[PDB]
Design a protein around this ligand. Structure first.
Ligand SMILES: *[C@@H]1O[C@H](CO)[C@@H](O[C@@H]2O[C@H](CO)[C@@H](O)[C@H](O)[C@H]2NC(C)=O)[C@H](O)[C@H]1NC(C)=O
Ligand SMILES: CCCCC/C=C\C/C=C/CCCCCCCC(=O)O
Ligand SMILES: *[C@@H]1O[C@H](CO)[C@@H](O)[C@H](O)[C@H]1NC(C)=O
Lengths: 49, 49
């Protein structure tokens, strides 16, 4: 689960808090990235980074 | 719009992780975002509006 403004950081050759300290991807990455909004489900739970 | 000059700086954006600013758009042209920590610049200008 990501903040929502850090969805753009889940990509090869990125910078930020998530790309540096939490989750990285290689430069030569093969695959797909899927995301969707879950404001009605995850807004009453504890999430950290 | 107004512009500002940047001189005699040590440009590390990690202090922005200590603040509470989140950027919805961050895109660089001509440089990878991962190469901004080991590079030095000559003349830096900042336009804001
Ligand atoms: C990160 O920001 C915090 C505040 O959000 C800074 O902590 C302050 O530091 C100054 C300077 O030493 C102290 O006078 C204050 O008492 C500290 N606390 C607050 C709540 O203002 C901190 O120095 C910043 N930098 C780092 C590297 O953590
Ligand atoms: C006032 C600017 C002084 C000169 C700075 C120039 C180059 C060094 C780095 C610049 C990138 C701007 C900060 C990007 C922070 C990303 C944070 C995020 O993705 O959430
Ligand atoms: C600007 O500084 C004030 C005072 O420290 C702080 O409360 C506020 O969050 C800062 N704003 C941003 C966008 O970082």
């Amino acid at each position: 689960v990501v903040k929502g403004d850090d969805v753009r950081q889940i990509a090869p050759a990125q910078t930020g808090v998530i790309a540096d300290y939490n989750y990285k991807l290689p430069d030569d990455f093969t695959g797909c990235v899927i995301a969707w909004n879950t404001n009605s489900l995850d807004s009453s739970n504890e999430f950290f980074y | 719009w107004e512009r500002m000059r940047i001189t005699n700086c040590v440009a590390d954006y990690s202090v922005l992780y200590n603040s509470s600013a989140s950027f919805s758009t961050f895109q660089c042209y001509g440089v990878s975002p991962t190469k901004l920590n080991d590079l030095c610049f000559s003349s830096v200008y900042a336009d804001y509006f």
